[PDB]
Design a protein around this ligand. Sequence first.
Ligand SMILES: N=C1N[C@H]2[C@H](CS[C@H]2CCCCC(=O)NCCCCCC(=O)O)N1
Ligand SMILES: N=C1N[C@H]2[C@H](CS[C@H]2CCCCC(=O)NCCCCCC(=O)O)N1
Ligand SMILES: N=C1N[C@H]2[C@H](CS[C@H]2CCCCC(=O)NCCCCCC(=O)O)N1
Ligand SMILES: N=C1N[C@H]2[C@H](CS[C@H]2CCCCC(=O)NCCCCCC(=O)O)N1
Lengths: 125, 125, 125, 124
Amino acid sequence: GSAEAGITGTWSDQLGDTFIVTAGADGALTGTYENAVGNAESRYVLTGRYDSAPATDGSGTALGWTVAWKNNSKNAHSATTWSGQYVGGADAKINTQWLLTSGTTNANAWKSTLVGHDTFTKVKP
Amino acid sequence: GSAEAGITGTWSDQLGDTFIVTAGADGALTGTYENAVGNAESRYVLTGRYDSAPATDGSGTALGWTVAWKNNSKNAHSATTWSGQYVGGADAKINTQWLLTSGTTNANAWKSTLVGHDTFTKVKP
Amino acid sequence: GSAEAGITGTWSDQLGDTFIVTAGADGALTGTYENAVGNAESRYVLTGRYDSAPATDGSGTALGWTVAWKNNSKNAHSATTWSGQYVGGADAKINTQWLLTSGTTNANAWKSTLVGHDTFTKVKP
Amino acid sequence: GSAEAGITGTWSDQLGDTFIVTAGADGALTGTYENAVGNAESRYVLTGRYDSAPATDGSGTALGWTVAWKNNSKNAHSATTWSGQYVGGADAKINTQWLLTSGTTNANAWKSTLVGHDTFTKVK
Ligand SMILES: N=C1N[C@H]2[C@H](CS[C@H]2CCCCC(=O)NCCCCCC(=O)O)N1
Ligand SMILES: N=C1N[C@H]2[C@H](CS[C@H]2CCCCC(=O)NCCCCCC(=O)O)N1
Ligand SMILES: N=C1N[C@H]2[C@H](CS[C@H]2CCCCC(=O)NCCCCCC(=O)O)N1
Ligand SMILES: N=C1N[C@H]2[C@H](CS[C@H]2CCCCC(=O)NCCCCCC(=O)O)N1
């Protein structure tokens, strides 16, 4: 599975953080976001989806995933979703834009959502 | 399961589409996005995450999910991620912003990502 | 001008705030963003552009503007841009999405930008 | 000076396009958005604002501007806004995110707006 094998592996973003992802044969993404070094308390579950039969015209493979920022010892009461595309080749990349929503009271809702972007480079199979 | 029972159920967005979601005990979100009526060809898998121990200060519960727009008969080579928060009460709602990325060649990548927002209203447990 | 006269006026957003705008014959937007009552210390300059010959097929009129949050007495070291479209009719609207960027250090650039949305309703011309 | 002097000039983005901007002493931004070479049919007016007394603690200078995609010969019935911040130094940058809304009917309004990002490098 071409998109499946291309997406699956370890990726690192522009901030230095690490994302380990497994693309399944049914379109599922599962893995873990790790901070810049890899210690337990800095790791969070990610789950998402990808187009498991992408176009064959040179376009990338659409995908997205979510991290809720709660693990077994921390909770930032917030969730980030990355939306983007895997672009293959010797120099494969996942180009994303992201939305980070914090839980807020309705009065503070206007400032609940950060937006950003990140490019991931593959580090390992 | 306060946030668990609040989120789980059937929801309707402002466009009229339906979102059936199950929030699990471990923070997973799993479900199906459908058009207005529920016809098989119009249904897509959704997977995401939410804060399963949210704050108790009146803030909403952060969450996110992804739909890759491929099912058993259609494929739009794109994925949308909703990022937002569930706000409880009798008038319960999920307020989100979303990112829809289409797979594209690198020359078209500047127009790969739509942004929007949607409020979901609960219609059934 | 139809879009010129439609956009020109006083508008109020979903948060209660006030947007006073003049749409010029050449596509310029100029005005002031204030609070619910127009307290002088709460007034900021806005500048923007609009499509001064928009479609007449029922589409709205594209437009955008910027407020830098600095005035005679306050400076939040930030700027919001709104992007959207004017839709005429008896109860006219401007539907927008907005980006708010704060000056940050490189290390905090990742959280420099909030995203949201607002619908403005016309109150006076 | 100083965010004034840093911002003012010619910038080029990641796609190769050009923006010429003047930052005014009152917080105004004015200029033109063009293509790679400055073909007249490809020029559009931009207007915006910036923080004209930014922090000095190393933070960038917040700014934003709009281009409506209509000039003397073309109209794409759309407008982009960039929101970002100017960071000085020898290799000066403006890091932005942007929103491009097209005029739509209400039925197409859900797909009216593209989002993206761009880093501008000063060229002149
Ligand atoms: N590697 C990355 N790190 C950042 C981006 C998108 S995900 C983000 C890290 C998010 C960690 C959880 C967190 O800090 N959540 C609370 C953020 C609220 C910030 C308050 C605000 O300025 O609105 N990519
Ligand atoms: N209920 C909702 N429907 C819309 C919003 C965010 S998800 C979206 C439906 C997306 C369906 C899949 C789809 O049409 N994918 C391709 C979209 C690219 C459109 C190209 C263009 O005209 O710019 N919420
Ligand atoms: N009427 C509106 N008010 C809000 C929205 C978009 S414009 C915004 C008001 C912005 C006022 C200036 C301001 O507070 N700037 C700095 C805010 C940074 C918050 C930092 C964070 O929590 O991420 N619409
Ligand atoms: N240098 C840049 N070029 C792109 C980004 C943000 S501004 C954008 C250029 C936009 C030119 C005007 C334009 O094409 N407007 C209509 C966009 C139609 C998108 C619909 C589609 O084909 O999917 N930066």
